[PDB]
Amino acid sequence: AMKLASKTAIVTGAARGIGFGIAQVLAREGARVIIADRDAHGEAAAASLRESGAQALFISCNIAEKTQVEALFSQAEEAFGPVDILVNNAGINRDAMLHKLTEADWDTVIDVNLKGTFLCMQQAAIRMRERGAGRIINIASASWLGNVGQTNYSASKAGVVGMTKTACRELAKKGVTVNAICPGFIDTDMTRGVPENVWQIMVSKIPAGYAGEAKDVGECVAFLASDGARYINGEVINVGGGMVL
Amino acid sequence: AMKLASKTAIVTGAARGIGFGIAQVLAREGARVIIADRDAHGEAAAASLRESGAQALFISCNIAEKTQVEALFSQAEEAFGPVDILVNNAGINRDAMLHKLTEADWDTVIDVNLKGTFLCMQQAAIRMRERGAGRIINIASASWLGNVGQTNYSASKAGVVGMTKTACRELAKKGVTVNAICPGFIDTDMTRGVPENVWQIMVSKIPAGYAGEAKDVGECVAFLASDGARYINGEVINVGGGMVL
Amino acid sequence: AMKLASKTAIVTGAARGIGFGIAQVLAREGARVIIADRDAHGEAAAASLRESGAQALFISCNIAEKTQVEALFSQAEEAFGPVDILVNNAGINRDAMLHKLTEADWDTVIDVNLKGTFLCMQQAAIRMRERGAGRIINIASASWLGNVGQTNYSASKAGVVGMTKTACRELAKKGVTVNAICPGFIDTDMTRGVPENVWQIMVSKIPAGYAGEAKDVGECVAFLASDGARYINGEVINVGGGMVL
Amino acid sequence: AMKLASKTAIVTGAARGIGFGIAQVLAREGARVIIADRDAHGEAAAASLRESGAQALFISCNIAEKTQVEALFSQAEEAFGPVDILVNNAGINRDAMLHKLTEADWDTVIDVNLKGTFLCMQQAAIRMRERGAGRIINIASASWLGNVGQTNYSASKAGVVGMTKTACRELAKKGVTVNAICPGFIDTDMTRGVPENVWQIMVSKIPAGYAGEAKDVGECVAFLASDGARYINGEVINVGGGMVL
Ligand SMILES: NC(=O)C1=CN([C@@H]2O[C@H](COP(=O)(O)OP(=O)(O)OC[C@H]3O[C@@H](n4cnc5c(N)ncnc54)[C@H](O)[C@@H]3O)[C@@H](O)[C@H]2O)C=CC1
Ligand SMILES: NC(=O)C1=CN([C@@H]2O[C@H](COP(=O)(O)OP(=O)(O)OC[C@H]3O[C@@H](n4cnc5c(N)ncnc54)[C@H](O)[C@@H]3O)[C@@H](O)[C@H]2O)C=CC1
Ligand SMILES: [Cl-]
Ligand SMILES: [Cl-]
Ligand SMILES: [Cl-]
Ligand SMILES: [Cl-]
Ligand SMILES: [Cl-]
Ligand SMILES: [Cl-]
Ligand SMILES: [Cl-]
Ligand SMILES: [Cl-]
Ligand SMILES: [K+]
Ligand SMILES: [K+]
């Protein structure tokens, strides 16, 4: 009934969008969910999961700062014990054409999407490699293989895939799986913030014929986090309705 | 609790090995399973499933002949109703170096592994595209990106991945998902034939440090067959403990 | 002065389109070219190369038939000596939706594009693995990763990529390189035969903004065939102006 | 004749190893070469290219500082005219296991390998988009798809590949090609430091049976930088004797 019962999970950027969708599917499978986010709306997201009957806790955290990541994993374990699942979802966009991208927009996107994902992966690796069990699921983007106006975003997401495949080689023998999910075009506050015509152009590229939901990504994460996906490691699973960006 | 309940699934080459493991997982999820295979032992395989408390039926069929594939879907529907899931696993080996592969061994591997997967996929498409729903899951091989002494096998499995991505672009808008699985080194009777010393050397190369089971491939098939994996389409998922052949 | 000077090369389907473009560039680099094709127009193509000051010979041949492929290499070696370069370009199209592709259109495309490419590669392997030197360049398609209405073509081209990687692993230690080229959309008689709206839709996908020329593919073949590309093996190079089909 | 005559090329980190090998091949093809590196030995490198009868110049430059990258392109064009070719070879290693990598070793590798490549790519894009012609060749690593003890290096090289494909989509219409090269195990003065028993293990992973040379990478750069490779764009070409890291 609940393939993730008795498992603690940390989901970064789970205050809204895809992150909250993953927290909802993990919580539904009986997992204790730690909502890690820099926005105080994460408390409304945790209170929403507890009201549905699940066990959830919000922990304010800027994954770009190592001291806050160390504090995140410390409080999470003092709250729901050992962390068995890590979902690196936290991400941001500062789009610009290569010839216009500012050094500031470059630094912020790489510091959060790439270094941020590194600092979290590291705290999970230090623990999971000793316990001989663990699940690391990184959210990348279909943009990891190129996308106009996303020099900094494609670089960070492509970097997340490289790390995912490196972590697989170092933690696989420790009974840990590290996999990446590349969501195509999902319906969230970020995608609803783009202009009308931009929405239709993207949906016209989706063979399924519609923008995915945050739970579509959550269903794939819940599977990789289960014991049934123990032989899937270092993979990149596209959840974009067959879209080829 | 029974995600595949009320769904009929056809699994080719499921008399023994990986195909039977996939049949056991689909059955465990309360799915009516059809075991299609030339091997007569398939009758004892379907019986083993009816003994576990599931509904199963063996159909002696040669997927290389279109007239027998047309009979497979006809006989499968009048029994358990509309076919919602198709698992193309049937795949034989006739290994030989490129400079010595006989024209006969080539034709046998291609006619069964590639043309066979096409004939089954075609019959599933004619039906699923009208019912506006369906699941096609092709079992290909880590050998699709090359492997010594497998020119005919690498060609066939690489071809299966090519059709998989093509079917995705033609059946996605009809609500049908077409995905492929590439198993690594799976511990089965057929594989427990090579020298034990070569087998231990092969396992030392798997990052996970152990050979997978037929159910490992099944757990992934059961997920792609669920409604929760409706947005995963045209994907190649490796089930080899993070191994790169 | 000329990189491929003193080298004999066989180019299948070099009577027109990409094949003749490849033959023109190889000849420009001082390579003795063997125009292998099933159309008698290859005799005009070979004469056009001899009139340009290069050495060329046409040999009628259906790569689908092994006895005719064996006769091709025999006549090619007694004519210009040992074959140092093999370019598998010969290919056909019998496009149709998965639910309508006839068994005849399936057999013909797989027998030419896949089995035909194999029979040629096999004759090159038998000779090159003994001479300790060689070059095998297979023309695949950007459709190897899927394309609407090309279930048989994608399967055949994907199969060639799989074989390209298998051959690499078996002949790399012999000093032979096996590489594949995936042309995007090249301006030829076949491509100029499709409707005008299809031409604009295909060209609108090319970031470069135009359909490539036959010599663009030939320039890449001339490089892989040189000694400078002795450390490139088992690669899939796209020559489609950055098109992502 | 020489395919790169009258062309100005910038090769970062070309004072030694692969970088200097790339400069030698570009010089041999008649291209003016700007050696950009923090290593003062870059003067002896440029002088060695002038002794061979080519036009070479050394410009001390820290690619992590945008003001020095802006001065590099300014001083480079004032001396040898418009920059037609940009080779991003600059790279460093600060290897460590995921659970040990210091924040400092992470920052220096990302600041030089990823941000450094970005700053140079940006100065090239700003100039090449107005001229309507140009070549950007990024040297990534076989480590972009993962490698033990290289979380930071695999992240920076995978990121370079991500940028490569993004720049392709934004500069293809402007007549500019952006490609990446992934060298496998290359023999350089920066690799003959490990014991031979370590060298043998790495070589047994190379199907070619031997480690490559700096010029094997240079030959591929000279081709992509030629007018004949104008239709190759957004590609990742492996130069590792068919080795799969
Ligand atoms: N939505 C889409 O269509 C696609 C998005 N993605 C990725 O999916 C992830 C989530 O996407 P959305 O839900 O649309 O994003 P969103 O912007 O709607 O929500 C992201 C959440 O991450 C949090 N966050 C951002 N930076 C953070 C940091 N440094 N530390 C902690 N929390 C931080 C924000 O507070 C926010 O709650 C991102 O990594 C995004 O790049 C991937 C491809 C497609
Ligand atoms: N033209 C394009 O845009 C693209 C073409 N390709 C591939 O490039 C190759 C050449 O394409 P095009 O020049 O446009 O085609 P084409 O039809 O103009 O020329 C192909 C040549 O192959 C020969 N041929 C066909 N079957 C043969 C057989 N069984 N034995 C011997 N010769 C045979 C034909 O006589 C013809 O001369 C084909 O393999 C094609 O699939 C792939 C990507 C795109
Ligand atoms: Cl700036
Ligand atoms: Cl920040
Ligand atoms: Cl949702
Ligand atoms: Cl499970
Ligand atoms: Cl033979
Ligand atoms: Cl034979
Ligand atoms: Cl039919
Ligand atoms: Cl530190
Ligand atoms: K994949
Ligand atoms: K490639």
PDB file of N, CA and C in Angstrom, chain B residues 51-123:
ATOM      1  N   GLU B  51      -1.568 -20.118 -10.096  1.00  0.00           N
ATOM      2  CA  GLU B  51      -1.384 -20.734  -8.754  1.00  0.00           C
ATOM      3  C   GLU B  51      -1.113 -19.627  -7.726  1.00  0.00           C
ATOM      4  N   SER B  52      -0.485 -18.524  -8.156  1.00  0.00           N
ATOM      5  CA  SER B  52      -0.178 -17.388  -7.245  1.00  0.00           C
ATOM      6  C   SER B  52      -1.458 -16.588  -6.964  1.00  0.00           C
ATOM      7  N   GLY B  53      -2.533 -16.857  -7.719  1.00  0.00           N
ATOM      8  CA  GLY B  53      -3.836 -16.179  -7.551  1.00  0.00           C
ATOM      9  C   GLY B  53      -4.133 -15.145  -8.629  1.00  0.00           C
ATOM     10  N   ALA B  54      -3.374 -15.139  -9.731  1.00  0.00           N
ATOM     11  CA  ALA B  54      -3.596 -14.163 -10.826  1.00  0.00           C
ATOM     12  C   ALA B  54      -4.207 -14.865 -12.046  1.00  0.00           C
ATOM     13  N   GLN B  55      -4.638 -14.086 -13.044  1.00  0.00           N
ATOM     14  CA  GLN B  55      -5.237 -14.633 -14.293  1.00  0.00           C
ATOM     15  C   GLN B  55      -4.163 -14.616 -15.387  1.00  0.00           C
ATOM     16  N   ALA B  56      -3.812 -15.784 -15.938  1.00  0.00           N
ATOM     17  CA  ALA B  56      -2.776 -15.853 -16.996  1.00  0.00           C
ATOM     18  C   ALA B  56      -3.185 -16.861 -18.077  1.00  0.00           C
ATOM     19  N   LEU B  57      -2.603 -16.733 -19.276  1.00  0.00           N
ATOM     20  CA  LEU B  57      -2.922 -17.636 -20.414  1.00  0.00           C
ATOM     21  C   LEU B  57      -1.718 -17.751 -21.357  1.00  0.00           C
ATOM     22  N   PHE B  58      -1.315 -18.984 -21.683  1.00  0.00           N
ATOM     23  CA  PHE B  58      -0.178 -19.224 -22.611  1.00  0.00           C
ATOM     24  C   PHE B  58      -0.712 -19.360 -24.039  1.00  0.00           C
ATOM     25  N   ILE B  59      -0.023 -18.726 -24.993  1.00  0.00           N
ATOM     26  CA  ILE B  59      -0.410 -18.763 -26.436  1.00  0.00           C
ATOM     27  C   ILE B  59       0.837 -19.058 -27.276  1.00  0.00           C
ATOM     28  N   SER B  60       1.010 -20.320 -27.686  1.00  0.00           N
ATOM     29  CA  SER B  60       2.170 -20.715 -28.528  1.00  0.00           C
ATOM     30  C   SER B  60       2.144 -19.843 -29.785  1.00  0.00           C
ATOM     31  N   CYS B  61       3.041 -18.856 -29.864  1.00  0.00           N
ATOM     32  CA  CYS B  61       3.056 -17.937 -31.032  1.00  0.00           C
ATOM     33  C   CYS B  61       4.479 -17.612 -31.502  1.00  0.00           C
ATOM     34  N   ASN B  62       4.672 -17.605 -32.827  1.00  0.00           N
ATOM     35  CA  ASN B  62       5.962 -17.269 -33.488  1.00  0.00           C
ATOM     36  C   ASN B  62       5.809 -15.831 -34.000  1.00  0.00           C
ATOM     37  N   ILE B  63       6.261 -14.854 -33.206  1.00  0.00           N
ATOM     38  CA  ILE B  63       6.141 -13.398 -33.535  1.00  0.00           C
ATOM     39  C   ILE B  63       6.780 -13.066 -34.892  1.00  0.00           C
ATOM     40  N   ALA B  64       7.587 -13.969 -35.460  1.00  0.00           N
ATOM     41  CA  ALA B  64       8.230 -13.707 -36.772  1.00  0.00           C
ATOM     42  C   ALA B  64       7.183 -13.762 -37.896  1.00  0.00           C
ATOM     43  N   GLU B  65       6.069 -14.471 -37.665  1.00  0.00           N
ATOM     44  CA  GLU B  65       4.961 -14.615 -38.654  1.00  0.00           C
ATOM     45  C   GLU B  65       3.844 -13.626 -38.296  1.00  0.00           C
ATOM     46  N   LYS B  66       3.484 -12.746 -39.235  1.00  0.00           N
ATOM     47  CA  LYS B  66       2.430 -11.718 -39.001  1.00  0.00           C
ATOM     48  C   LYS B  66       1.074 -12.387 -38.737  1.00  0.00           C
ATOM     49  N   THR B  67       0.755 -13.466 -39.464  1.00  0.00           N
ATOM     50  CA  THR B  67      -0.546 -14.178 -39.299  1.00  0.00           C
ATOM     51  C   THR B  67      -0.687 -14.731 -37.875  1.00  0.00           C
ATOM     52  N   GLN B  68       0.421 -15.111 -37.230  1.00  0.00           N
ATOM     53  CA  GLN B  68       0.347 -15.656 -35.845  1.00  0.00           C
ATOM     54  C   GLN B  68       0.230 -14.495 -34.850  1.00  0.00           C
ATOM     55  N   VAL B  69       0.842 -13.346 -35.159  1.00  0.00           N
ATOM     56  CA  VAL B  69       0.767 -12.159 -34.254  1.00  0.00           C
ATOM     57  C   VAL B  69      -0.675 -11.642 -34.293  1.00  0.00           C
ATOM     58  N   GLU B  70      -1.302 -11.654 -35.478  1.00  0.00           N
ATOM     59  CA  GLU B  70      -2.712 -11.195 -35.627  1.00  0.00           C
ATOM     60  C   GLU B  70      -3.617 -12.121 -34.807  1.00  0.00           C
ATOM     61  N   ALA B  71      -3.285 -13.417 -34.775  1.00  0.00           N
ATOM     62  CA  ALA B  71      -4.066 -14.422 -34.014  1.00  0.00           C
ATOM     63  C   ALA B  71      -3.834 -14.212 -32.513  1.00  0.00           C
ATOM     64  N   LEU B  72      -2.606 -13.840 -32.130  1.00  0.00           N
ATOM     65  CA  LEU B  72      -2.243 -13.595 -30.706  1.00  0.00           C
ATOM     66  C   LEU B  72      -3.194 -12.552 -30.103  1.00  0.00           C
ATOM     67  N   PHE B  73      -3.259 -11.357 -30.701  1.00  0.00           N
ATOM     68  CA  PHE B  73      -4.143 -10.268 -30.202  1.00  0.00           C
ATOM     69  C   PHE B  73      -5.620 -10.682 -30.295  1.00  0.00           C
ATOM     70  N   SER B  74      -6.014 -11.410 -31.347  1.00  0.00           N
ATOM     71  CA  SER B  74      -7.431 -11.849 -31.487  1.00  0.00           C
ATOM     72  C   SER B  74      -7.798 -12.793 -30.334  1.00  0.00           C
ATOM     73  N   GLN B  75      -6.980 -13.829 -30.127  1.00  0.00           N
ATOM     74  CA  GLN B  75      -7.190 -14.858 -29.071  1.00  0.00           C
ATOM     75  C   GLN B  75      -7.029 -14.243 -27.674  1.00  0.00           C
ATOM     76  N   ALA B  76      -6.172 -13.229 -27.535  1.00  0.00           N
ATOM     77  CA  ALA B  76      -5.938 -12.585 -26.219  1.00  0.00           C
ATOM     78  C   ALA B  76      -7.141 -11.728 -25.805  1.00  0.00           C
ATOM     79  N   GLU B  77      -7.782 -11.057 -26.769  1.00  0.00           N
ATOM     80  CA  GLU B  77      -8.944 -10.166 -26.482  1.00  0.00           C
ATOM     81  C   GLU B  77     -10.203 -10.977 -26.160  1.00  0.00           C
ATOM     82  N   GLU B  78     -10.556 -11.967 -26.985  1.00  0.00           N
ATOM     83  CA  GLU B  78     -11.779 -12.773 -26.706  1.00  0.00           C
ATOM     84  C   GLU B  78     -11.662 -13.448 -25.330  1.00  0.00           C
ATOM     85  N   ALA B  79     -10.449 -13.488 -24.765  1.00  0.00           N
ATOM     86  CA  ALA B  79     -10.204 -14.120 -23.446  1.00  0.00           C
ATOM     87  C   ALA B  79     -10.292 -13.090 -22.309  1.00  0.00           C
ATOM     88  N   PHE B  80      -9.303 -12.191 -22.191  1.00  0.00           N
ATOM     89  CA  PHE B  80      -9.303 -11.188 -21.087  1.00  0.00           C
ATOM     90  C   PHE B  80      -9.740  -9.787 -21.547  1.00  0.00           C
ATOM     91  N   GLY B  81     -10.200  -9.630 -22.792  1.00  0.00           N
ATOM     92  CA  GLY B  81     -10.657  -8.306 -23.267  1.00  0.00           C
ATOM     93  C   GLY B  81      -9.547  -7.454 -23.878  1.00  0.00           C
ATOM     94  N   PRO B  82      -9.816  -6.148 -24.120  1.00  0.00           N
ATOM     95  CA  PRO B  82      -8.841  -5.233 -24.719  1.00  0.00           C
ATOM     96  C   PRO B  82      -7.423  -5.288 -24.130  1.00  0.00           C
ATOM     97  N   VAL B  83      -6.414  -5.337 -25.009  1.00  0.00           N
ATOM     98  CA  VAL B  83      -4.977  -5.379 -24.606  1.00  0.00           C
ATOM     99  C   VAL B  83      -4.520  -3.944 -24.322  1.00  0.00           C
ATOM    100  N   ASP B  84      -4.225  -3.639 -23.054  1.00  0.00           N
ATOM    101  CA  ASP B  84      -3.787  -2.276 -22.648  1.00  0.00           C
ATOM    102  C   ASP B  84      -2.260  -2.201 -22.571  1.00  0.00           C
ATOM    103  N   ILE B  85      -1.590  -3.336 -22.337  1.00  0.00           N
ATOM    104  CA  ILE B  85      -0.101  -3.337 -22.197  1.00  0.00           C
ATOM    105  C   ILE B  85       0.537  -4.401 -23.100  1.00  0.00           C
ATOM    106  N   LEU B  86       1.616  -4.027 -23.791  1.00  0.00           N
ATOM    107  CA  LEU B  86       2.380  -4.953 -24.669  1.00  0.00           C
ATOM    108  C   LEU B  86       3.851  -4.879 -24.264  1.00  0.00           C
ATOM    109  N   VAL B  87       4.420  -6.006 -23.832  1.00  0.00           N
ATOM    110  CA  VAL B  87       5.854  -6.043 -23.425  1.00  0.00           C
ATOM    111  C   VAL B  87       6.611  -6.908 -24.441  1.00  0.00           C
ATOM    112  N   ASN B  88       7.357  -6.267 -25.342  1.00  0.00           N
ATOM    113  CA  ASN B  88       8.154  -6.985 -26.372  1.00  0.00           C
ATOM    114  C   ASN B  88       9.471  -7.420 -25.725  1.00  0.00           C
ATOM    115  N   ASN B  89       9.576  -8.700 -25.346  1.00  0.00           N
ATOM    116  CA  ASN B  89      10.805  -9.236 -24.693  1.00  0.00           C
ATOM    117  C   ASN B  89      11.465 -10.285 -25.597  1.00  0.00           C
ATOM    118  N   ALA B  90      10.671 -11.057 -26.347  1.00  0.00           N
ATOM    119  CA  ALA B  90      11.224 -12.094 -27.251  1.00  0.00           C
ATOM    120  C   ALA B  90      12.525 -11.583 -27.882  1.00  0.00           C
ATOM    121  N   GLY B  91      13.636 -12.288 -27.642  1.00  0.00           N
ATOM    122  CA  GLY B  91      14.948 -11.893 -28.188  1.00  0.00           C
ATOM    123  C   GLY B  91      15.961 -13.018 -28.067  1.00  0.00           C
ATOM    124  N   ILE B  92      16.360 -13.603 -29.200  1.00  0.00           N
ATOM    125  CA  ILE B  92      17.344 -14.727 -29.219  1.00  0.00           C
ATOM    126  C   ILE B  92      18.727 -14.188 -29.595  1.00  0.00           C
ATOM    127  N   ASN B  93      19.774 -14.987 -29.345  1.00  0.00           N
ATOM    128  CA  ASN B  93      21.174 -14.595 -29.656  1.00  0.00           C
ATOM    129  C   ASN B  93      21.848 -15.637 -30.553  1.00  0.00           C
ATOM    130  N   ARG B  94      22.616 -15.152 -31.527  1.00  0.00           N
ATOM    131  CA  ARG B  94      23.408 -15.965 -32.487  1.00  0.00           C
ATOM    132  C   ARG B  94      24.734 -15.216 -32.642  1.00  0.00           C
ATOM    133  N   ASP B  95      25.414 -15.007 -31.510  1.00  0.00           N
ATOM    134  CA  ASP B  95      26.703 -14.270 -31.441  1.00  0.00           C
ATOM    135  C   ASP B  95      27.720 -14.863 -32.420  1.00  0.00           C
ATOM    136  N   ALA B  96      28.518 -13.977 -33.021  1.00  0.00           N
ATOM    137  CA  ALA B  96      29.584 -14.302 -33.996  1.00  0.00           C
ATOM    138  C   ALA B  96      30.251 -12.996 -34.420  1.00  0.00           C
ATOM    139  N   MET B  97      31.568 -13.054 -34.636  1.00  0.00           N
ATOM    140  CA  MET B  97      32.334 -11.886 -35.037  1.00  0.00           C
ATOM    141  C   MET B  97      31.839 -11.390 -36.393  1.00  0.00           C
ATOM    142  N   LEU B  98      31.943 -10.072 -36.602  1.00  0.00           N
ATOM    143  CA  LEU B  98      31.514  -9.428 -37.835  1.00  0.00           C
ATOM    144  C   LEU B  98      32.079 -10.142 -39.070  1.00  0.00           C
ATOM    145  N   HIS B  99      33.362 -10.515 -39.046  1.00  0.00           N
ATOM    146  CA  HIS B  99      34.004 -11.176 -40.216  1.00  0.00           C
ATOM    147  C   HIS B  99      33.593 -12.652 -40.346  1.00  0.00           C
ATOM    148  N   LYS B 100      32.793 -13.200 -39.420  1.00  0.00           N
ATOM    149  CA  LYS B 100      32.403 -14.634 -39.553  1.00  0.00           C
ATOM    150  C   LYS B 100      30.894 -14.842 -39.360  1.00  0.00           C
ATOM    151  N   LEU B 101      30.125 -13.784 -39.083  1.00  0.00           N
ATOM    152  CA  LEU B 101      28.658 -13.960 -38.884  1.00  0.00           C
ATOM    153  C   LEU B 101      28.039 -14.505 -40.175  1.00  0.00           C
ATOM    154  N   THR B 102      27.396 -15.676 -40.094  1.00  0.00           N
ATOM    155  CA  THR B 102      26.753 -16.300 -41.281  1.00  0.00           C
ATOM    156  C   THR B 102      25.501 -15.503 -41.654  1.00  0.00           C
ATOM    157  N   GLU B 103      25.090 -15.581 -42.920  1.00  0.00           N
ATOM    158  CA  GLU B 103      23.884 -14.858 -43.398  1.00  0.00           C
ATOM    159  C   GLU B 103      22.659 -15.457 -42.688  1.00  0.00           C
ATOM    160  N   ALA B 104      22.717 -16.752 -42.354  1.00  0.00           N
ATOM    161  CA  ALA B 104      21.606 -17.449 -41.659  1.00  0.00           C
ATOM    162  C   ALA B 104      21.445 -16.905 -40.230  1.00  0.00           C
ATOM    163  N   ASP B 105      22.532 -16.879 -39.443  1.00  0.00           N
ATOM    164  CA  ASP B 105      22.485 -16.363 -38.043  1.00  0.00           C
ATOM    165  C   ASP B 105      22.028 -14.901 -38.033  1.00  0.00           C
ATOM    166  N   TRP B 106      22.388 -14.125 -39.057  1.00  0.00           N
ATOM    167  CA  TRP B 106      21.946 -12.706 -39.126  1.00  0.00           C
ATOM    168  C   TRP B 106      20.419 -12.655 -39.281  1.00  0.00           C
ATOM    169  N   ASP B 107      19.906 -13.306 -40.330  1.00  0.00           N
ATOM    170  CA  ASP B 107      18.453 -13.342 -40.648  1.00  0.00           C
ATOM    171  C   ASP B 107      17.620 -13.823 -39.450  1.00  0.00           C
ATOM    172  N   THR B 108      18.093 -14.844 -38.725  1.00  0.00           N
ATOM    173  CA  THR B 108      17.338 -15.387 -37.558  1.00  0.00           C
ATOM    174  C   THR B 108      17.231 -14.338 -36.441  1.00  0.00           C
ATOM    175  N   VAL B 109      18.339 -13.683 -36.088  1.00  0.00           N
ATOM    176  CA  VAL B 109      18.305 -12.658 -34.999  1.00  0.00           C
ATOM    177  C   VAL B 109      17.443 -11.457 -35.409  1.00  0.00           C
ATOM    178  N   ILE B 110      17.620 -10.942 -36.628  1.00  0.00           N
ATOM    179  CA  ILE B 110      16.840  -9.756 -37.099  1.00  0.00           C
ATOM    180  C   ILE B 110      15.350 -10.098 -37.244  1.00  0.00           C
ATOM    181  N   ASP B 111      15.023 -11.231 -37.873  1.00  0.00           N
ATOM    182  CA  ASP B 111      13.602 -11.622 -38.099  1.00  0.00           C
ATOM    183  C   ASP B 111      12.852 -11.784 -36.764  1.00  0.00           C
ATOM    184  N   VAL B 112      13.519 -12.264 -35.711  1.00  0.00           N
ATOM    185  CA  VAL B 112      12.847 -12.490 -34.391  1.00  0.00           C
ATOM    186  C   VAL B 112      12.928 -11.248 -33.492  1.00  0.00           C
ATOM    187  N   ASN B 113      14.127 -10.696 -33.296  1.00  0.00           N
ATOM    188  CA  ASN B 113      14.319  -9.534 -32.386  1.00  0.00           C
ATOM    189  C   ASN B 113      13.809  -8.209 -32.968  1.00  0.00           C
ATOM    190  N   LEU B 114      14.014  -7.954 -34.264  1.00  0.00           N
ATOM    191  CA  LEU B 114      13.580  -6.645 -34.828  1.00  0.00           C
ATOM    192  C   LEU B 114      12.219  -6.756 -35.530  1.00  0.00           C
ATOM    193  N   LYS B 115      12.101  -7.603 -36.557  1.00  0.00           N
ATOM    194  CA  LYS B 115      10.805  -7.723 -37.282  1.00  0.00           C
ATOM    195  C   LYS B 115       9.717  -8.199 -36.310  1.00  0.00           C
ATOM    196  N   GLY B 116      10.056  -9.120 -35.403  1.00  0.00           N
ATOM    197  CA  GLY B 116       9.080  -9.627 -34.418  1.00  0.00           C
ATOM    198  C   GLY B 116       8.533  -8.498 -33.563  1.00  0.00           C
ATOM    199  N   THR B 117       9.418  -7.622 -33.074  1.00  0.00           N
ATOM    200  CA  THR B 117       9.004  -6.467 -32.234  1.00  0.00           C
ATOM    201  C   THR B 117       8.125  -5.531 -33.075  1.00  0.00           C
ATOM    202  N   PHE B 118       8.427  -5.395 -34.372  1.00  0.00           N
ATOM    203  CA  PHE B 118       7.624  -4.525 -35.273  1.00  0.00           C
ATOM    204  C   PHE B 118       6.204  -5.077 -35.449  1.00  0.00           C
ATOM    205  N   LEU B 119       6.088  -6.348 -35.839  1.00  0.00           N
ATOM    206  CA  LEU B 119       4.763  -6.985 -36.058  1.00  0.00           C
ATOM    207  C   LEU B 119       3.877  -6.821 -34.816  1.00  0.00           C
ATOM    208  N   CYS B 120       4.434  -7.028 -33.614  1.00  0.00           N
ATOM    209  CA  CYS B 120       3.646  -6.902 -32.353  1.00  0.00           C
ATOM    210  C   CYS B 120       3.265  -5.445 -32.092  1.00  0.00           C
ATOM    211  N   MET B 121       4.221  -4.532 -32.294  1.00  0.00           N
ATOM    212  CA  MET B 121       3.987  -3.112 -32.081  1.00  0.00           C
ATOM    213  C   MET B 121       2.891  -2.615 -33.022  1.00  0.00           C
ATOM    214  N   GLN B 122       2.951  -3.071 -34.277  1.00  0.00           N
ATOM    215  CA  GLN B 122       1.993  -2.677 -35.294  1.00  0.00           C
ATOM    216  C   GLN B 122       0.576  -3.073 -34.860  1.00  0.00           C
ATOM    217  N   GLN B 123       0.379  -4.336 -34.465  1.00  0.00           N
ATOM    218  CA  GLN B 123      -0.956  -4.830 -34.028  1.00  0.00           C
ATOM    219  C   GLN B 123      -1.445  -4.044 -32.806  1.00  0.00           C
TER     220      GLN B 123
END
